[PDB]
Design a protein around this ligand. Structure first.
Ligand SMILES: CNc1ncc2cc(-c3ccccc3Cl)c(=O)n(CCCCN)c2n1
Length: 264
């Protein structure tokens, strides 16, 4: 990773230690800090996130500019994503995009996830809140935090998580595909919360009994079919990210295919 001198960085506004929007000398950056008195585990986890991010070079994965590790407070410096987190963005822009735009967002996310999977990285916490959006509507996977625990067992939420990951702690790229299907539903609904007010136990019971999320309004049939396949109980029946990228690319290149809507 690039070691950046603190004099080349100015923090301007808190946007999330803390996360700041700032400038790198100028280019806008996001800046995550670690506070004094951090433990050995905290340090390994913090610098670990940067270490992971530094091993990746892909359009749909947040870019690391560098780290401040020689000086305190320590910092991770990334590209700045002008539209922020995808979940909040969708909810504040409800109805404002074309179906083609929404599908193109999903293709980007899927391409990033295919790259992570092929680089032997299991995300475990894929959700729209962990995707960032730039001023070209490019969606990039973020959140490579090392220390994550499943809710009731950062907390990884049950209702984005595959059955096998919940039931026996088996997290793989196939569990990330399940999560991706939930992200598909988040995007096509402009940030609706999956399963609404069902409790975690009600969601798990529903899933195990064969229920799945219903079609979004105005959702292309092909898109609903794809998210449904991501939620197969049997991992081997789920598409790989390779398959998802291939299918989304075909739909985008023949965009009339998206005019055929699933019954709402
Ligand atoms: C608002 N635009 C914006 N742009 C870029 C980033 C980058 C980071 C980040 C991520 C990992 C390591 C280090 C960093 Cl700095 C970050 O935490 N936020 C805050 C929101 C994240 C929500 N999920 C970002 N926000």
């Amino acid at each position: 990773t690039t070691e950046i001198h603190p004099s080349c960085v100015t923090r301007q506004k808190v946007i999330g230690g803390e996360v700041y929007k700032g400038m790198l000398k100028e280019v806008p950056v996001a800046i995550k800090t670690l506070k004094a008195g951090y433990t050995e585990k905290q340090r390994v986890d913090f610098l670990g996130e940067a270490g992971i991010m530094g091993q990746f070079s892909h359009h749909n994965i947040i870019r690391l500019e560098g780290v401040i590790s020689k000086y305190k407070p320590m910092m991770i410096i990334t590209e700045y994503m002008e539209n922020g987190a995808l979940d909040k963005f969708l909810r504040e822009k409800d109805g404002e995009f074309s179906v083609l735009q929404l599908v193109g967002m999903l293709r980007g996310i899927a391409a990033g996830m295919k790259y992570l999977a092929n680089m032997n990285y299991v995300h475990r916490d894929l959700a729209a809140r962990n995707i960032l959006v730039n001023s070209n509507l490019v969606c990039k996977v973020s959140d490579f935090g090392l220390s994550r625990v499943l809710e009731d067992d950062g907390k990884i939420p049950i209702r984005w998580t595959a059955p096998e990951a919940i039931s026996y702690r088996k997290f793989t790229s196939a569990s990330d595909v399940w999560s991706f299907g939930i992200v598909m539903w988040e995007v096509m609904t402009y940030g609706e919360r999956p399963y609404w007010e069902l409790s975690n136990h009600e969601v798990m019971k529903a899933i195990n009994d064969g229920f799945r999320l219903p079609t979004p309004m105005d959702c292309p049939s092909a898109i609903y079919q794809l998210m449904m396949q991501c939620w197969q109980q049997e991992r081997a029946r789920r598409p790989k990210f390779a398959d998802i990228v291939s299918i989304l690319d075909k739909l985008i290149r023949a965009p009339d295919s998206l005019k055929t809507l699933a019954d709402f």
